Every structure is written in C-alpha cells, then in structure tokens.
Design a protein around this ligand. Sequence first.
Ligand SMILES: C[S@@+](CC[C@H](N)C(=O)[O-])C[C@H]1O[C@@H](n2cnc3c(N)ncnc32)[C@H](O)[C@@H]1O
Ligand SMILES: Cn1c(-c2cccc(-c3ccccc3)c2)ncc(O)c1=O
Ligand SMILES: [Mg+2]
Length: 215
Amino acid sequence: AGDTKEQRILNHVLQHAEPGNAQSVLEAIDTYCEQKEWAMNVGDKKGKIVDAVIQEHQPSVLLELGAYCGYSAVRMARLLSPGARLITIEINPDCAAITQRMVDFAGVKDKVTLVVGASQDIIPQLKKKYDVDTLDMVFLDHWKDRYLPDTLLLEECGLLRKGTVLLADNVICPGAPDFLAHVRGSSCFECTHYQSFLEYREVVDGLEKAIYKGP
Ligand SMILES: C[S@@+](CC[C@H](N)C(=O)[O-])C[C@H]1O[C@@H](n2cnc3c(N)ncnc32)[C@H](O)[C@@H]1O
Ligand SMILES: Cn1c(-c2cccc(-c3ccccc3)c2)ncc(O)c1=O
Ligand SMILES: [Mg+2]
C-alpha cells in the first residue's frame, strides 16, 4: 500500500532484504529508519545489548510486550535454539499484521507466537491459553506507563520464577522512572543498567535488566 510508515518499512524490506535471512531484514529496517523515517524499533545499537542478554541467559520461553513491525521479534527469534518459543503481544491489529509478514519473510515463523490484544488482558491468559508455566525472559517495550503495572501483573499471575529475566527498553527516553524505582527498590529483583542511546539518535537512553529472585 505505502499508506502508513509501518507499511513503508515493510515494503522496503520486501524490496531489499533476502527472504529467510533475519540479519538482512534487520539491516534493511535499520537503514530505512536511519535514512528516511525514524521509527521506534529497538534498533541495532540497543539490539546488541538485547543480543548479549539473550546469549547469556539462553531463554526457551520468551515473552515480548509490544511487537510493532516485528523488528525485535526477528532480532530475538534468530538467536533462539530449536524448540524455543517467543510469544509477542501487540495491541494494534495493523502492527500485528505487519509483524506476522515480517517474521514469515525473515524465516523465523516457527519460533514466534503473535497474539493480538492488550498485554494486561493477554498476560493473565498465558497459563490458560498459551501453554505457559513460568517465563524464562520478558522483553518490555510497549507504552512505558505499562511497565510497572505489567511487571506487578506478571508476578501476581505466577509467571515469574527465581531466575526469570526482565529486560526493559527506553527506561531513560521516553523513560519509565516508576518501573525503575520498583525493580531497583525491591529485594525480589537484581538489576543492571545498560546506558546507550535512543534508536537512530544521539539522545541518551538505556535498558534495565531485572532478574527475579523469587517471592
Ligand atoms: C516500541 S513499539 C515496539 C517495538 C518493538 N519491540 C521493536 O523493537 O521492534 C511499542 C508497541 O507496543 C504496542 N503496545 C502499546 N501498549 C500495548 C499493550 N498494552 N499491550 C500490547 N502492546 C502494546 C504499540 O502498539 C506499539 O506497537
Ligand atoms: C514505545 N516506544 C516509543 C514510544 C513512542 C510513542 C509513545 C510512547 C509512550 C506512550 C505512552 C507512555 C509512554 C511512552 C513511546 N519510543 C521509542 C521506543 O523505543 C519505544 O519502544
Ligand atoms: Mg523501545
């Protein structure tokens, strides 16, 4: 179509990336967003921090909040082992449609379960509908005012265990100070900050890793 920025990001990938080649898809999205239209993909610089977290902790059951065009889903899915699952939750059904196409194009279809709906509604269904016991890792990257209540909801729903890894993008810009005060101030988390930059910009941003210690 070319009507929305999201459709234009996808079109660019369709025109320039190699199918089945996750790295190719990510480079194409990053190039377009660096050069033509800024978009809220975690991007390549903060992407390397995301990579490093996945490579250290090696999650088999991963949850992502906020899928957008599929950039981070592809980024994380490409590093996952055979049999590993990425469940990604996306509120905007038009973003979701782009994400499925992006994931299919990149060759990581079988790693990904895309769910359309609000994280606050879908999180408490994970046990009942999606075969989840507890989560290995969660990537928080949706509207920043949802970080705190969704972390509280994840805990309450029984989805965190000793060693569950939370990784939150944008804890500086646009920021999530209430979420940070909670995880850093609670003895139930061990936290690490990764200072970086907002995607495609020179504005300072950061990620926070928070490891659940158990209740
Ligand atoms: C930063 S974008 C996601 C970017 C993506 N993680 C990446 O790096 O490629 C934020 C997304 O979260 C979605 N979102 C916002 N609130 C949500 C919620 N409560 N539940 C699920 N998705 C939500 C928005 O529609 C938007 O697509
Ligand atoms: C979501 N997001 C955004 C973004 C873009 C528009 C609005 C909001 C938002 C909405 C409500 C409360 C707080 C923030 C956030 N910018 C950069 C990212 O990397 C990202 O993941
Ligand atoms: Mg982000």
